């Protein structure tokens, strides 16, 4: 079913990434109808346009629990718009943020589980998200967690368990493998890399002072500036410099962490028994 533009109004800006709106898809035009996602393009240029296309395509593809939900598109072809559903209770990290340590150790295992099936699911169609953060997973309700923004994911090639991207724009290095870091390297195992910088996040319940970016900043020094953080950082990394171990971060989970954060990118856990792992600690606690 099709999206006519003229009927979509706009409610409130949700955040820049590229930018995704609430609107409320309104046919009947007496406010009744369906308030939804939207996702448009800031920049539309002919290059940013057949990579949006690109998501549009990769989200369609997915129907997991813990992959937001593909609605449409709006064509009303170089002006496309991506509606999805709207999650209201926002992002993992701004849900977070807000609530902090009145959400316990068995919800924060439980959206950990789900982040895990989202993922274990993802890689089953042989795509790399290259973006996983609290900041790109959503909150439905209490009980569910959905990963959003599939805006730097790639296909693997037929024959290559990895996709290496040519000319890196923005990159969330402070989430990256050090392969990625160092020949721009993207693969299942760098997203389990990404996965347990999801955990720290979690576990330090987005407190900015212990942020991925403050954390690995005082350990090359807050003096390193542009590219030379990426240096220094690759150097860290090889030398086994990591993130500390949240306070009161239970050791089961410092120790999935650590065993994500692996130089060695074979020894990397699988998604698949990232969930198992997960959902043998809940089903302990
Ligand atoms: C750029 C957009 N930013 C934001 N979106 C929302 C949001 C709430 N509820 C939502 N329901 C469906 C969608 Cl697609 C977004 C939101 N809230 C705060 C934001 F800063 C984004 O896509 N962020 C990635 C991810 F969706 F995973 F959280």
Known sequence: ??????????????????????????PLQDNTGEVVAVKKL??????????????????????????????????????????????????????????????????????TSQICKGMEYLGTKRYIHRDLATRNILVENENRVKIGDFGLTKVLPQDKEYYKVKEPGESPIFWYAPESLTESKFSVASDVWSFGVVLYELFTYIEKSKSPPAEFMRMIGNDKQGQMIVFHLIELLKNNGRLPRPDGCPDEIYMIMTECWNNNVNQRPSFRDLALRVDQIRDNM
């Open 1 to 26: 079913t099709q999206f006519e533009e003229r009927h979509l109004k706009f409610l409130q800006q949700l955040g820049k990434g590229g930018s995704v709106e609430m609107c409320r898809y309104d």
């Open 42 to 111: 800031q920049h539309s240029t002919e290059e940013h346009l057949r990579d949006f296309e690109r998501e549009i395509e990769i989200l369609k593809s997915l129907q997991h629990d813990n992959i937001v939900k593909y609605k449409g598109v709006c064509y009303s072809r170089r002006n496309l718009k991506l509606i999805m559903e709207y999650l209201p209770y926002g992002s993992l990290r701004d849900y977070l943020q807000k609530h902090k340590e009145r959400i316990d150790h068995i919800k924060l295992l439980q959206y």
